[PDB]
Design a protein around this ligand. Structure first.
Ligand SMILES: O=C1c2c(O)c(=O)ccn2N([C@@H]2c3ccccc3SCc3c2ccc(F)c3F)[C@@H]2COCCN12
Ligand SMILES: [Mn+2]
Ligand SMILES: [Mn+2]
Length: 177
């Protein structure tokens, strides 16, 4: 069972199509980087579930680069929040801060450090496939139920992969050698 076939079966087609466009834009082939194809789908789903819990969250992820920065610029212009160097994933209109969503197959503490290091005001929220999470100042933003649902979906994706013998590959491809 190919990872590419898993992605197209396990994820909603709107998620798959946006993941494909994002990979084309950054010059990556979903037929070759199939684990990355799956990771982008998973992360994209988490961002939509995050902004699902008028609307508290603007979704930056899932847009072509130009539109993504247009939304970021428009928000900064109307709130005076400092424009970030790196594209974030969400904007929280209640806390008035951008959010960076991370999903990792490794230890959350390790991935949190990697993310915090790369961006040096953007709130960070890391999820794992084991039910763990780590967030800036231990401020998890959402209520308990909302995070429990994200954790359950991630764990379900993991078990759906494991049943098709895809988990081990997916786990090891996150960080290079
Ligand atoms: O939006 C993201 C992004 C994140 O937000 C993230 O948390 C991790 C990684 N990201 N990257 C995603 C991405 C997203 C989710 C899971 C893995 C990857 S792996 C690199 C890659 C991404 C998108 C397309 C592509 F072809 C890639 F090679 C790029 C980093 O440059 C800003 C846009 N972006
Ligand atoms: Mn992003
Ligand atoms: Mn992210």
């Amino acid at each position: 069972m190919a990872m590419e076939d898993f992605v197209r079966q396990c994820f909603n087609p709107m998620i798959v199509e946006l993941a494909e466009k994002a990979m084309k834009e950054y010059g990556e082939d979903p037929k070759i980087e199939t684990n990355k194809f799956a990771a982008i789908c998973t992360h994209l789903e988490v961002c939509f579930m995050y902004s699902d819990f008028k609307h508290r969250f603007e979704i930056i992820e899932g847009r072509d680069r130009i539109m993504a920065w247009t939304v970021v610029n428009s928000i900064c212009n109307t709130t005076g929040v400092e424009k970030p160097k790196f594209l974030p994933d969400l904007y929280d209109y209640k806390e008035n801060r951008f959010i960076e969503i991370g999903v990792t197959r490794r230890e959350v503490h390790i991935y949190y450090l990697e993310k915090a290091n790369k961006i040096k005001k953007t709130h960070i929220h890391i999820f794992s496939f084991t039910g763990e999470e780590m967030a800036t100042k231990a401020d998890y933003t959402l209520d308990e139920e909302s995070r429990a649902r994200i954790k359950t979906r991630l764990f379900t994706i993991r078990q759906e992969m494991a049943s098709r013998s895809l988990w081990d590959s997916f786990r090891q491809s996150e960080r290079g050698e």
